[model samples]
Target chain A: MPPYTVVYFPVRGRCAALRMLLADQGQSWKEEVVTVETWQEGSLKASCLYGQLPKFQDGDLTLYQSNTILRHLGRTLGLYGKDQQEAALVDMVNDGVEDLRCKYISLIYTNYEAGKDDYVKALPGQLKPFETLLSQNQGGKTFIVGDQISFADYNLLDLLLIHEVLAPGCLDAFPLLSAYVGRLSARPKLKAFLASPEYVNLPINGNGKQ
Target chain B: PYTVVYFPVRGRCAALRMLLADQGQSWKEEVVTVETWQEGSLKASCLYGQLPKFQDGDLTLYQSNTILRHLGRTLGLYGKDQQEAALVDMVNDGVEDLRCKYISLIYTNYEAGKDDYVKALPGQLKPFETLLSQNQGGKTFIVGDQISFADYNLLDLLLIHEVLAPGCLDAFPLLSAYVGRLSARPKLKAFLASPEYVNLPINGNGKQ
Candidate 1:
């Protein structure tokens, strides 16, 4: 594997999925941590493609955008499902995760107090599509798109984790999601990574809230 | 039969529509008007309560980018190789990021936010121009010269943004010329001239 470096603030934030993907894949990567102070300086921010963190560098190729990095890693790392149709399914699953994650990010950053009630109220509707997907796929017996774990699983795992923090036991109503999260989190490498101090020390989101 | 369900506005689906047109694939548009959206059946029926839901054969998919990537996968517009495909995705994601900001401005506070958004447009757009320049003097497609699905999205993004801020592309020579090149492509040019493309406003609201 080429040397991979992730450039982001200390927060897991958007980089969690990719980090988990690497850790679970048993790949080593370098982390170039940025501070809010350095980010406010604007030089690195200006160079970023979408003016955001979680920029990735593989050798000389510098890539930005969180999903782009995930998909790129998915494609190269053999985690992007088995074939074309499966790849599309993976994209669909990741896109759904992204849709919910975007809502989660907005709630975290902008107006948690004012928005929390409505966000949590609408949370099930947001989460049901994933549950439905799990139900349709071999009764949630396997990873999100195929029989094996794909990159989208990492993203979905991170989303589910943050949402569980947002709404405790939210997945309990959806048996498949609840069990699927349990199954993926139990994978040895990912389990160790999740229990590590590096993972536990960081907030699930950038806002320093659960 | 592929059907794209969205409001009459071209906000999210324009890129996918452009891709279909460019690929010479025909799709039916299930256009939902403001009145229908207010009626709430379609909105409630949608899984995510979002527009730009898609139906491909027996499979139904939401998320415009998902639809685009599926098409890219099935239609041979993804990229030449794995590396190229990653670059294609990078470009698409950047386009999406900018699109999100543009949509936010258009729907939320066009009058108050337009100035600031337009002022900062160059920085946001320059990366793409740089991508083109690095590839082949802005002549090649956004990622490896083989016109991927992302080009379609970027073309639509640049076109509508130009509508928002005239002469915005003037500063970036490569972008201006690339826009002109993409516009002059025979099928896309004809699509640009068609009544179907012209009749609908870019935004759901009349602001854009």
Candidate 2:
């Protein structure tokens, strides 16, 4: 059996980044897909720590929260950063990604139609920080932070990819972010995984919108 | 030395301030007034266009939780082991989730949403109570025998919720006791009662 197991709904939702991390790292994990029928049964939902999906198992350690899973994988796989300062920078980037991600999620599940215009209008301002981050690091030639690829890169990449889907030309103005996305996406394992049916078939969210 | 830049309110910086005080660490405060922030230069320079910017030597960072985690790592408050660290992150994430909701209620919907928010407070707080119960029968810290960064964050959350709704934790003895126990720490006790913490409004808009 694989040492890791991911239990989530059929949608890409919160699990996309961590799944991409595991795949790109050449790690194997079991997917315990919980159907809507099963999730509605309440037993599994009740068993969850925060009463949410994306529960992960690493041998005896069962964890809740997507970022917790990502940090755990980052720690064990040496994907966090090279040193303490870098680790903190990695965390800062991830937190920024999370802040934007929350807004994205709210738009998708809660107020897609009513809020899309205002959200899209404010996106460039919301996205400029990332472009600035990229510009500061090796003139946008390297990963999100530091020379090595940290877990934040995976989360940020996932965030950027989804935004591109939501607004087709969102990255067109941000040259650094545009180039950064293309560079990271072209990684052999990640490219293959992005093209794979497992990733392609799942809806971006559970609401059947977007 | 370390430097913290934020608004006059306790807001997101309270937990980290508490952590620094409890650990006997000294930091300089660069308070950003509304007028100063309105100028937009400093805000533009901020990584996420938000406050609570932290500086430790040459390295500067934004985001409240990142600063907490950074201090956690440097001050030996994260955890004793990798597993303990993961548990620490789990606890902090839970704290962050609740904190976000609390922030939204305080800043956006206080007048109209207070009733529903307070009513649902117990359900929101029960998970922390349960976490305490499962770990050392509510005797030790949030995770592991030692105090982690999450403890300060959770402590701050519980404190503000008490301000939002008095006796909010009375129903959960473990959490109530947990708050009392953490508050009674010598340095933390002094910090909590000091003017630094007492003077600042919990939220920016003067609520709580």
Candidate 3:
């Protein structure tokens, strides 16, 4: 058995960012996909801490919450940042990503029928901060926080990719984000994983909205 | 001096405030009034366009959890080791998830949804109680025997829920005792009883 086991539904949902991180770092993890039918059966739901997907088991320790998994992997994998301050910066970027992702999720799952138009209309404002962060650092040439890519970058990358699917060319207005997404998508392992049937076959979200 | 800038309420900053108070750290608050927020400039200048922004000496940070983690990291309230730190994050994330749902119920549909929300409250809260049950027979802190940031966050989460639904913790003996033990701390007790925390509504919208 792999040292790490990630339990979630088959859809990428919240697990995509961590999956991309593991693939890029050349780490192997076992995946346990709980079917929707089983989820409705309520045993897993009853056992889940917050009745949510994406529970992780690291050896004997059980962990839930997607961001927790990301932070854990970042700490062990040397992708958090160079120091404490940089880690805070990484958190800042991730919080912004999470904020926007929550809104995106709300739209897809709860408000899609009526709110998609306004949600897409307000996309640029939600995304510009990352572009601004990039513009300030090394002429937007490197990753989000510092000289190397951190876990936050992987999360942000998945966010941008989903937004591009949500509204094609959403990143075009911000050159740095556009180029950064392009660059990260081209990494050898990430490139292969993104194009593989395992990833390609899954909808970006559970409800088949995105 | 460290200053927390937010509207005149204890919404997101409650946990961090409780942490600071419990640790006996001196800090100040720069309360932004509702009128000032409506003017739209402060919100605009804020990087993430939200409040509970924190300024510590030279470093300005946003996101309440980031501030909490930053304080925990600097103040040695995180954990003794890497494994304990991961457990800390796990507990904190669980707190945040429940808080998100609580916030939505308070702001979006309190009048109509409060019944069902309070009815389902036990399921939302038992996990923390179970965590304490597993650790040192529910007598110690959430993660390790030592107090971590997650303890303060969980305390605040449980406190606000009690206000939202009275006697909600009665069913969970461990949680009831945990809240009583944590709330009995000297500095935290004063802070909780003080008007600075009590005068402000638990939320910004004045629902709960």
Per candidate, chain B TM-score? 0.97, 0.98, 0.98
Which scores greater on TM-score, model 1 or model 2? 2
Q: Score the docking of each candidate (DockQ).
A: 0.69, 0.87, 0.73
> lDDT: which is higher, 1 or 3?
3
lDDT of 3 by residue, B149-191 (tens): 9999999999888888999999999999999999999999999
Docking quality of model 2: it rates as high
RMSD of 3: 1.4
* Candidate 3 ranges beyond 4 A from true positions: none
- Scanning candidate 3 chain A in windows of ten residues, the lowest lDDT window is A45-54
Q: What order do you get sorting by DockQ, best first? A: 2, 3, 1
DockQ computed for model 2 against the true two-chain complex using alpha carbons: 0.87
Residue range B36-70, candidate 1, lDDT tens digits: 88998888877667878898887788889999999
Interface RMSD of each: 1.5, 0.6, 1.0
Note the clash tally of each candidate: 0, 0, 0
Native A-B interface contacts kept, per candidate: 0.72, 0.80, 0.61
lDDT of 1: 0.88
If scored against the real structure, what TM-score would every candidate get? Answer: 0.94, 0.98, 0.97
Task: Encode model 2's per-residue lDDT on A135-197: one tens digit a residue.
Answer: 999999999989999899999999999999999999999999999999999999999999999
Instruction: Judge candidate 2 at residue B32 and give its lDDT.
Output: 98
Error of 1 at B42 (Å): 3.6
